[PDB]
Amino acid sequence: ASVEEIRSLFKQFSSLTPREEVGKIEDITIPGSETNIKARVYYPKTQGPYGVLVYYHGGGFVLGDIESYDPLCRAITNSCQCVTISVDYRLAPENKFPAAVVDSFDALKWVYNNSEKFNGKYGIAVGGDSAGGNLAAVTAILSKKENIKLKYQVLIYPAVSFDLITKSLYDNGEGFFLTREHIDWFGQQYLRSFADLLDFRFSPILADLNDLPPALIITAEHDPLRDQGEAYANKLLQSGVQVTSVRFNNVIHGFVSFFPFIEQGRDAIGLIGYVLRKVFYGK
Amino acid sequence: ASVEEIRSLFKQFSSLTPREEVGKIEDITIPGSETNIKARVYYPKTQGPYGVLVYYHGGGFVLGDIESYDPLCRAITNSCQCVTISVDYRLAPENKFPAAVVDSFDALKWVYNNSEKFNGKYGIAVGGDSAGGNLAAVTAILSKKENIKLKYQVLIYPAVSFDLITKSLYDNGEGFFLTREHIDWFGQQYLRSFADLLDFRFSPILADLNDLPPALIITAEHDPLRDQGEAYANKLLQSGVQVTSVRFNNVIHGFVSFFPFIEQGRDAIGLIGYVLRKVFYGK
Numbered sequence: 366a367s368v369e370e371i372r373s374l375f376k377q378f379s380s381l382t383p384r385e386e387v388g389k390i391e392d393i394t395i396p397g398s399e400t401n402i403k404a405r406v407y408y409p410k411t412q413g414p415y416g417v418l419v420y421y422h423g424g425g426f427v428l429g430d431i432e433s434y435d436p437l438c439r440a441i442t443n444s445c446q447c448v449t450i451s452v453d454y455r456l457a458p459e460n461k462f463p464a465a466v467v468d469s470f471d472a473l474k475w476v477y478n479n480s481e482k483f484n485g486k487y488g489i490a491v492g493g494d495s496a497g498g499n500l501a502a503v504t505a506i507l508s509k510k511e512n513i514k515l516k517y518q519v520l521i522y523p524a525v526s527f528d529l530i531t532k533s534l535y536d537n538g539e540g541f542f543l544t545r546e547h548i549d550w551f552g553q554q555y556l557r558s559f560a561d562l563l564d565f566r567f568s569p570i571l572a573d574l575n576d577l578p579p580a581l582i583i584t585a586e587h588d589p590l591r592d593q594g595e596a597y598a599n600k601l602l603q604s605g606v607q608v609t610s611v612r613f614n615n616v617i618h619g620f621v622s623f624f625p626f627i628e629q630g631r632d633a634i635g636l637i638g639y640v641l642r643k644v645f646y647g648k
Numbered sequence: 649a650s651v652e653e654i655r656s657l658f659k660q661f662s663s664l665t666p667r668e669e670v671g672k673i674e675d676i677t678i679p680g681s682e683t684n685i686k687a688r689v690y691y692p693k694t695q696g697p698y699g700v701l702v703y704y705h706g707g708g709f710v711l712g713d714i715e716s717y718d719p720l721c722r723a724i725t726n727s728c729q730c731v732t733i734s735v736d737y738r739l740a741p742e743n744k745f746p747a748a749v750v751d752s753f754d755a756l757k758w759v760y761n762n763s764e765k766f767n768g769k770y771g772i773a774v775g776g777d778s779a780g781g782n783l784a785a786v787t788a789i790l791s792k793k794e795n796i797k798l799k800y801q802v803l804i805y806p807a808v809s810f811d812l813i814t815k816s817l818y819d820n821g822e823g824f825f826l827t828r829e830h831i832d833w834f835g836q837q838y839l840r841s842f843a844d845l846l847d848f849r850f851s852p853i854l855a856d857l858n859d860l861p862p863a864l865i866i867t868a869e870h871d872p873l874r875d876q877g878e879a880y881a882n883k884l885l886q887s888g889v890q891v892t893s894v895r896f897n898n899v900i901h902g903f904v905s906f907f908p909f910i911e912q913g914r915d916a917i918g919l920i921g922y923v924l925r926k927v928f929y930g931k
Contacts, residue, residue: 610897639918
């Protein structure tokens with residue numbers, strides 16, 4: 366199948382996942398530095414003021430979008446009882462690195478500067494899964510540099526480094542949905558050249574991690590990205606940042622997206638909701 | 649340092665921990681088959697009806713008690729929004745195996761048969777940490793044998809088997825609070841003879857685990873008991889029981905008891921609260 370066919374397939378598969386009712390949904394356009402960035406704003410059913418999670422979908426920088434991630438963003442919204450803003454960042458191969466990062470950061474800065482629009486008085490967090498977790502992490506690094514003060518970062522099986530060495534890569538690189546061949550191919554679509562492998566905006570493990578917001582990092586036992594995610598937690602800890610790093614056993618990369626039929630995915634969304642309700646509301 | 653001494657230092661340290669307000673607290677005495685069993689009943693600040701969590705404290709079968717665990721059980725009560733009944737089972741070396749088990753199962757049976765005193769319409773679960781997670785797991789096995797239908801079991805770094813073989817036992821057996829010498833000494837205080845090593849009431853991994861209640865099993869990366877706790881989860885799964893097995897990284901055996909200082913401990917309590925709210929209230 367073509368990239369277009371697979372992008373469509375994501376949306377199609379999404380229509381088989383129940384969409385939880387939320388308080389209110391609205392589609393906005395965020396004025397970006399290089400583009401106008403579509404976002405979907407989900408309000409919870411509770412009364413404000415709120416904390417605001419800016420969310421970046423996964424899909425290897427190439428696939429996924431607001432629609433296919435709509436069921437997950439609804440479930441997250443209800444779990445965290447917070448405003449969630451799902452960002453349609455530019456995808457590769459059409460828009461090479463660093464387009465996704467530029468959009469993800471532009472969107473966060475705007476949300477931060479406009480949180481009053483969402484009655485966002487309890488502060489701003491970032492979150493995302495896989496490639497989205499990469500973007501959340503990188504967005505949190507870029508924020509510190511600009512004195513944007515984030516409450517929290519939720520990194521769901523994030524990609525944090527180019528990797529040819531982790532045990533989990535070789536143990537889990539075939540037969541568990543996300544394969545070596547996928548990882549290589551996504552990387553070729555996204556990156557401009559070999560030099561980009563030196564860029565912290567692609568590999569956030571490279572960055573100086575002190576003074577970043579506190580983090581929840583979820584990894585999956587049977588995931589090739591598992592070891593590198595747990596390494597990112599370690600480096601955060603070494604840099605004096607609080608992080609709860611949790612390995613969900615018996616599950617694969619992507620498991621949180623399959624929450625309707627992987628119960629561990631539901632429980633992960635429950636934990637995400639707990640930590641955000643805690644940091645935002647003292648709950 | 650004598651048994652009575654080390655019990656007292658445990659008590660004293662826990663004495664300095666700020667206690668969370670709950671709804672109401674009632675002390676009760678359950679008529680056990682071998683003894684009168686003190687239990688403390690914690691009501692959440694919400695209104696009923698409730699699910700009920702029967703909780704067994706850790707401490708190697710030798711230490712801990714209602715008072716010393718009082719801060720944790722308050723924290724759990726507020727997180728799960730459920731009635732929590734902390735059980736004062738008989739301790740070793742004064743009362744050897746299977747005294748703790750007899751008391752734990754007698755308490756659970758009585759609560760189950762008396763669920764109305766607690767407005768416990770939404771059903772009964774068991775939970776416990778360490779030696780208490782052993783007791784919860786064993787209580788669930790004994791329940792199934794007598795047709796008592798529990799909703800859930802929460803096993804926090806449980807002891808599930810006599811162990812001379814797991815990699816975590818050797819990797820983590822010194823320097824991380826719970827040492828080989830402790831494990832040896834506790835087992836020496838608790839067990840009657842070598843024959844007790846065949847008894848599933850000591851090593852619940854031995855039991856047929858079919859038809860047991862769904863489980864949350866929390867392990868700790870730097871814990872000698874880690875591998876066996878993950879084995880128990882895998883054996884449950886193999887037996888057709890739903891289980892969410894989560895390894896909290898960067899922490900040691902006992903970390904949930906240190907929740908006031910170890911934020912990962914607080915997040916573990918959040919997760920426990922989520923899974924129980926979900927199973928009881930469909931939240």
